[model samples]
Target chain A: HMAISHVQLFSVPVSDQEKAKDFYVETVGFDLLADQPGVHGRWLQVAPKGADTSLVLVDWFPTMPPGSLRGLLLRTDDVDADCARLQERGVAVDGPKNTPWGRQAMFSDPDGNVIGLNQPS
Target chain B: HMAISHVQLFSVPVSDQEKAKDFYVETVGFDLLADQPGVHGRWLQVAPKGADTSLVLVDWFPTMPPGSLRGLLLRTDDVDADCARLQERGVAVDGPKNTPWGRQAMFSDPDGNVIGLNQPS
Candidate 1:
């Protein structure tokens, strides 16, 4: 059997690398995994600290424009508290609304890629 | 600190759920985590077995049309072997090529979402 391990990175299309990196690393509290020169541009990657999957903030995909990605779901300890913290950091958060699946708060990255934060009910 | 734990899901835009689900689960060897009725469409989720993050095959995003997503990187045990396996499953894979970062193979899903298979050097 071909042993595929896990997802390493998902490209998050962004217009500005520095701004998006700051939003993910500082505002969202993800660890900056890699920030170095790559073949096409600076390879900026971030993820929730110690998470297996990371996001590469990219500007290269012609079809995937900045803000094209939506419904990026992240797991958090407290959706209510985290949404408040994000608002304090100047992000407009929609809700820690109760849903059938969980309590979810919606926000966007600097480039308007939608992020849904969840605390399972 | 916000205490974000991990990436829960990343939406993968697709034209057909059955076709994309087959590609991810049957061909790519990911487990079918969830397949149920969702608000907009089917809540089709898939991932590498026991992985922290999963993919939601979606057809609802207005901006993110099918094939818009590119450069989803997956980690594998052996890039060469896995590429060959993918080829056998009728997926066109290109280059188990050695890059500065790793041995890499590039392929696209039926909807043209690019998937990069990597075995780090």
Candidate 2:
């Protein structure tokens, strides 16, 4: 058997580690999984509290420029309420529009990486 | 409460949908979660069976070119065995070298998106 189970991490390219970490942890309300020194600059990680996968905010990859990633879809139980909270925190939320996939909204981190918030139908 | 849960999807930039899907499903041994027609070309999604996060192979983002993604870390039970299996399947797997993180290996998809396989310490 292959025995592969889950995604451990995804390296999210960011220009500034502290800024990205603050936005993801404080503004976006993710749990700070790791924050320490490592071979790849600072190995900062964050994710939803009980998610199987986490994201590492990185500035190491030459090919992956900061804010280049798009279409990162995050699932939430309440999209409309979360959008309001983000807006109150000075994060501009685009919409909680009705799509075939259910209520969906858009927001960008400080680095401009687009995140799609979906409450799947 | 924020009520955000898990990562629903990550858009993987790929040039050919069929090829990428085949490699991820057949060679890499991920379970096909979805394969249907959608607004942004084919809605091809794959992930380790029962994983919270899934990947959507996409060619729609003009800014995100094929193979730009790096540092996608996959967790497996047996890194050495998995590397051998991948090599036998005509996929070039690099190493299961010892690191602070335990055994680790490297490989790339047909589109050259690098994936790190790790058996964490």
Q: After superposition, how far is residue B97 of candidate 1 from its true place, in Å?
A: 0.5
Residue A7 of candidate 2: its Cα lDDT?
90
Runs in model 1 lying further than 4 Å from the true structure: none
Query: What would the per-residue lDDT of candidate 2 be over residues A1-121, giving only the tens digit for each residue?
Result: 5878999989888998899999999989999998999896889999999899999999999888898889899999999999999999999999989999889999998888899999999
Clashing pairs in 2: none
Q: Write down the RMSD of candidate 2 (Cα, Å).
A: 0.9
Clashing pairs in 1: none
Candidate 2 local Cα displacement, residue B9, angstroms:
1.1
Q: RMSD per prediction, one decimal? A: 0.9, 0.9
True contacts kept of each: 0.85, 0.83
Worst 10 residues of 1 chain A by lDDT: A1-10
Could you tell me the lDDT of residue A24 within candidate 2?
Answer: 95
Quote each prediction's TM-score: 0.98, 0.98
* DockQ comparisons of all candidates to the true complex: 0.86, 0.84
